[PDB]
Design a protein that fits this description.
part of a larger assembly; 4 chains; A little secondary structure; B alpha+beta; C alpha/beta; D little secondary structure; C: Ribosomal Protein L15, Chain: K, domain 2; two-stranded parallel ribbon; D: little secondary structure; OB fold (Dihydrolipoamide Acetyltransferase, E2P); 0% helix; RNA-binding; ribosome; translation; release factor; 50S ribosomal protein L33; 50S ribosomal protein L35
Chain lengths: 53, 63, 84, 86
Amino acid sequence: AKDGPRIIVKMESSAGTGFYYTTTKNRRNTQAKLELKKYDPVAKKHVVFREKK
Amino acid sequence: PKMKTHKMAKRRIKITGTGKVMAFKSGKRHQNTGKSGDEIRGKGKGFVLAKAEWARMKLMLPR
Amino acid sequence: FKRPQKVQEEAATIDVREIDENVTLLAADDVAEDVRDVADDADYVKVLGAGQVRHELTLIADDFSEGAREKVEGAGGSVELTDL
Amino acid sequence: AHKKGVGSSKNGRDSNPKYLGVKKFGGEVVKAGNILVRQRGTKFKAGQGVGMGRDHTLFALSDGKVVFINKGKGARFISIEAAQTE
RNA sequence: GGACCCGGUGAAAUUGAACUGGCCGUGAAGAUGCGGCCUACCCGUGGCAGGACGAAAAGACCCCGUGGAGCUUUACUGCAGCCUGGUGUUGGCUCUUGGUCGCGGCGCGGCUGGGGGCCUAACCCUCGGAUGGGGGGACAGCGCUUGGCGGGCAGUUUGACUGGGGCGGUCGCCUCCUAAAAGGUAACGGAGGCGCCCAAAGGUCCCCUCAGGCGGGACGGAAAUCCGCCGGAGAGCGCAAGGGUAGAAGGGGGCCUGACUGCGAGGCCUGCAAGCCGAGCAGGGGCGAAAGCCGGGCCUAGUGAACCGGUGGUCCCGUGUGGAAGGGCC
RNA sequence: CUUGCCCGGUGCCGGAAGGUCAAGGGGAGGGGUGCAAGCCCCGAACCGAAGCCCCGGUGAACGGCGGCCGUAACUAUAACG
RNA sequence: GGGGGAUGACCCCAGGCGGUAGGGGAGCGUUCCCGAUGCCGAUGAAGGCCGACCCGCGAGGCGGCUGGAGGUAAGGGAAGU
RNA sequence: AGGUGGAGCCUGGGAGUGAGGGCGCGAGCGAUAACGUCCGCGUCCGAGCGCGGGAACAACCGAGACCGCCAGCUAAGGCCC
RNA sequence: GAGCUGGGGCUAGGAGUGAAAAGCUAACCGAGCCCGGAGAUAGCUGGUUCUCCCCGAAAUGACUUUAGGGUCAGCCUCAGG
RNA sequence: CCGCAAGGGGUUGUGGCGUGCCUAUUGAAGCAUGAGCCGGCGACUCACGGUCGUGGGCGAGCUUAAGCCGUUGAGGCGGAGGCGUAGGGAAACCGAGUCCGAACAGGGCGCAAAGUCCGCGGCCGUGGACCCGAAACCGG
RNA sequence: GUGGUUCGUGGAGCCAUGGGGGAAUCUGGGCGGACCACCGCCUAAGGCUAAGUACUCCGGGUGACCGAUAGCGCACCAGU
RNA sequence: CGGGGGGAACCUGGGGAACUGAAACAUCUCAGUACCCAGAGGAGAGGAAAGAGAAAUCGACUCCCUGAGUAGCGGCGAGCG
C-alpha cells in the first residue's frame, strides 16, 4: 500500500508453517517486535501465528 | 477484413453461447488493498450489461 | 494469461446419443456390430455421456466421459486409440 | 504550490437514504428500512422510534434491516395473515 | 485644367428583387417594406454629402481548435560537435612502485595493476632543390564501445473551470443549510471537517448509572477531593459535523481475537465501474452453565482503474521428451 | 575626465590529495543440468575515466551593490549613535 | 383497429391527421441490360415550341406548329439520377 | 377499484440533438436592479404550435390548421366612426 | 569616395547573404518556388438534391487536457411476442 | 378574343387581407450571411470484412484457388478449409456437466427449437470514402 | 553494438553482420528457439539453372464504357 | 573483343522521410511507403537445403487459394499481424 514509514507499516504472520499468511496493517507506535495470534493455514486448522516480517 | 481489441479480448472477456459475456469480478484487489478479508470474497466474475455490445462486437468472430 | 508463442496440444468433441443417432445413419458402414470412427462431422474422437448408450458397439476412439463409458457398458464396448 | 483561504466556498457531495419498501407491501428478504447501513436488520416490521407508536409492513419473510437508531430496529414480529397454511 | 453643353469611342467592383418619403412607436432591442398618422403627381440633367447599418477584405484587436510557424532559459527528450576511460593496424630497450593469493613480516613465488625514459622499423607529418634525409612516434590521426558536457541545433509539450482571456481562485471525498417537505438539482451560494487512525475504542461475559446545581469539610477561597440531596442524559462516545442513543455505543474487570477461510438467499444507490447490507449453510475456534453474540470498531470521510513490475505460497504451463529461464493461479 | 564596492550562487581558470561513479579487469560464492569429467549464467571484495562533489583564484565574465529606531537640529535625514 | 371483403370495393364509427433533425411505409419521372412464345416511325424517331382531358402528386396522355433521323419497351433488372 | 379506452412492457435494428430561451410560481445570488444569470414545479417555442386577439408584437387570453370561396352557433375578445 | 558604375562570374534558399529591421533572395520569404507525400488531418465553416404517407424529439444527468465535441443514460421510430 | 361558345381566355380600377428566399440560429423581414441573370457540371458511392432484417435452397448447411467444357461462347467436376454439432475452465483436464473449494451455497451452461449458404437492404470497421475549405510539415 | 523476423530490449533463438578475440576436417561441425543431458535433422563459410506469378509503350478482341464542359486533359495544321 | 546511352509500367539491390492515426505527443503508425541512386532483364526475384517441424513426418525455388485476421508483437493502446 501507500508505504509510509509513518507508524504506518504493513505486515503479516506465518502459521507455524500451516504454511502461508493472511492480511494485516500495523503501527510500531507500541510493542515493536510484538505480534502474535492464531489462525489456520491451508495447514489443517488453527496454529500459532507470529506476525513479524 | 477484421480483428478486435484482441486486447480486452485477452484480459477481461469471453462469451457464453447465451450470447452474453463476462470478465472476473474486478473490485479492488491486486494492487492496493491491505483492506480486509470478506472483501476478498469479492472476486469472482462481473457481468456488465448494455455496453457489453461494443465489446462482444469489436471482438466478434473468434470469441 | 496468454503465452509467449504457440505450443498447444489436441483432442475433439464426439459424444453419445449424438452417435447412436446420426450414427444410426452410420449403419451404412460399420454400423452393425459398430466399429465406429466416422469420418463425418468433427475431428479427434471423443465421447460425450448424456443420452443412453446403445446399438451395442465397440468404439475405436480416444475416450469419453463418466456415465458414457458407463452407459457404454450398458450394451457395447470401448476401444482406445494408439496406446492406452 | 498550495491552496488558499478566505474563500469558504466548499460545495458538498451526495448521499441516498430512503425507507425502501415503505410500510405494508410485498415483503422480500431484502434491504428493509434504510437510514444507517452497516445496519443490523431485525424481525418483521418496526414500531420503535423517537416518535412514539410503531409501524407494520404487512410483509413477512426471513427478515429486514435497520438503520442504527432512526426508524427503530425490528423485533415486534408481524409475518402477516399472508403467512398461514398455504 | 477637368467638370458642363457637341460629335467619335466607350469599362470597370457591388449587387436576391424592387415602382424605396418624414414621423412617432415597434421587432432581435438604432427599419423606405410592420401599426397609426402627415405630406405625397410622372420623369429627368448640374450638384451636396446624410441614410440605405453603403463598396474593399469570410477583423489583423478578441476568445475558442488537446490548429501552425519563428526566437528564448535550470522546460522534455535527443543529435551534431567537444572532453573522456578500455580496444585496434600502436614495435623495441631499460628504470620502477602497488595489489593479490600461495609458500604489522621480510625472503620468494605466479599473478596483475601504476608509471620514466632515446630510441623506431606502423603511423603522420616534413621538406628543403629526387624516391633520402629530417621532425613527432605508438602520438596520434583515425574504428569500434564508455561516459560527459551540449538550445549550436531537431522534434513535442506548456489542462478545465472563467457569469470576457489573464492575475486572483478551484478542482476528491465526509456534514449542515439551499432541496419548496419521497427521493434529487446549478451557481466562483452559504459555513466546516479528511488522504488519520485505535494492536486494543477489537470479540464477548460480568458490573457502572453523566454532565451540572445546591448544602457540608483536607491540603482547598475560580476551577478538585468526599459526604448528603435534585436530574425526557443538557454530559458520554480519539478526531468535522449531523443521527444516535444510558436500555447505552457510553465508564471498569475477566478471560479471548472470528480485526476467520469456503460462501452467501436477497436488497439498498446505479447510465460504468464502483460503493454498500446481509440472515442462513460448512470447517474451525472464543465468551457464557446456558438462550445466544463474534466474519474489527456507533456510523456516514481515512481514496483509485487496468495495465508496468517485487516477494511468501502453487507444484497449473514449460514451446523435440528429462528439467530450468520464463508464465499462468493465490 | 573618470571608471569604485562585493566571487556566498553562476560561467570559467586552476587543483586533483580525498568521496563518487561506466564500460572493464579481476576472484570469494551461489545456480541449472550433470552417473562423472564437464557444460552454460548470476557473480562480487578490490583496482579502475572524464565528469560531479570538495579547496582556491576569478568582474571592460553573468550578475548583484540593505532595512528600520535614536540624536545638535527652538522645525528637517543630518556630525554622531 | 374492427364488423363480411369476390380480386375489386362497399357500409359504420372509433379515430386522429400542423411539424424541422430524425424513424418506419408508398409512389414519380432520368440514361442503360432484358426484346420473361415484346418491336412503333418519312402520312416523323427525338428534342423543341404551345394547350381550359388523366393524377392528391412528382408525371401522364393527347391535339396544333418545328426538325431530320431513330429507338420505344407491356416487366423485372442496373445505376456517374 | 376502476368508469377508461387507448396508453403500457420486454427483446431487437435504425437515430438525433450532449449548449435554449420566454412566463407563472417557490427558492439562490444580485442594490429582492436588468429583456441578468442559477435550481426547481407546469406551461410555453420549437423556422411554423401555421389562425384569433392585444393596433402592429414567436410568444401573454382563447385555439389544435386533411380538403370543400359566395351556410349556422359561439370563444377569448368586441359592437359612435 | 567605407564613391557611382558596365561587362564577366561565386555563393542559395532551414540554406544563402545581410555596415543587420528578420531585412532581400524574380514584385506579399518570420523560413523561397514548381512537381511529389496527397484528395495530409481540419470537434470549425459552408454546401447537402423528386413527390407523398404515418407518428413524433432534446437543448437534462453521469465521466472526460472534456467542455460550441462525445461515451452511457433519459426522451424517437419500426419488427415480433 | 370566344378552334374544346350562354363558359372561359388576357389585362387590370378599386378595395380586402398580406414582411421577400436560403444556411447557421434562444430567436430573424431581415440591417446576419448566401446569391446580379440565364443555361450545363456539381456532392452518402464501391470493395473486402462484420452486422441485424428480409427472399428463398437443403438442416449438417455451404464454397475457395483450379482442372476440364466453351458464334452463343453452356456450366459442370474441384472437398484443404470455415462457421454450427456441448460447453465449462488460466490450465491440467473433465465433460451434458463443469469451474471456486473441500463443499452439496453460487457463476457459466444443459434444456436441441438447429443453422447455413446466397440474394437483395438499414448499419458498423478498414479504407481519400457525404463534397470542396486553410495556415503548415516532409522529398526531389 | 544494430538488422530482418510476428518479437518493440524482452526467459528471446535462428540467419545476416559494425568492432575484438580467432576452432575443429566424419566419433568433425550448426541445428530443433536461454541453457543441459539424451534423441532426431542437416552437412554450410564458391557458382549456373528455363517453366509456374508481375507490368502495359506497343497490336488485337470485347463493353448493363462514354459522347463532345463525359472520355486520356488533348476525335485531328494541341502538350501547340 | 564487350560496354557504356536510352526506355510509360513492372524487377531487385544501394540509400531512405515527415504528415496522419494513437482523438496530445517523445515509443508506435503511415513503411521499407513516397522519392533519389545504381544496375539486370524481357522478365528479373529467387533457386537442390548447416531447410522445415516433430506423426521417426516432410523435402527445390516461385506463385494462387487456405492456413489465419488465428499462434503472436505492443505507452498490451492505436494498430501491426
